[PDB]
Amino acid sequence: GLMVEVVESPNHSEVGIKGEVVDETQNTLKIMTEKGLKVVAKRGRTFRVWYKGKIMRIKGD
Numbered sequence: 001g002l003m004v005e006v007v008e009s010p011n012h013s014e015v016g017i018k019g020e021v022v023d024e025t026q027n028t029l030k031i032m033t034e035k036g037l038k039v040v041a042k043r044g045r046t047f048r049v050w051y052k053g054k055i056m057r058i059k060g061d
Contacts (some may be wrong), residue, residue, distance in 0.1 A: 001052035006031040008038040008045035021049055029058075 002024055006014035008031065017033030030039040031047055036044065043060040 003051075004049040004051070005030055006033050006038075006045075006047040008033070008040065008047065009035065021047075024051065025051060030054060 002006070002021040004019060004021040005017075006019045006021070007013065008036065012016040015033050015035035017035065019031050019033035019037075020046055021031045022028065023029055028039060028041055029047070032038075038061070042058060046059045048057045
C-alpha cells in the first residue's frame with residue numbers, strides 16, 4: 001500500500017505528481033509521479049508517504 005504524493009526533480013515542480021513508492025524501509029527511496037521517476041535518500045526533494053500502517057513526511061534540507 002505504498003501510496004505517496006511526491007515532489008522531486010531540480011525545479012519548482014518538475015516531477016511532482018500522485019505516484020507510487022518503492023523501498024520505504026529497505027534502503028533508499030525511489031518514487032515516480034508523472035513527469036518521471038526520481039531516486040533519492042532521506043535527504044533530497046520533498047516527499048510525503050502513506051502506508052497501510054501509518055503516515056510520515058520526509059523533507060530534505
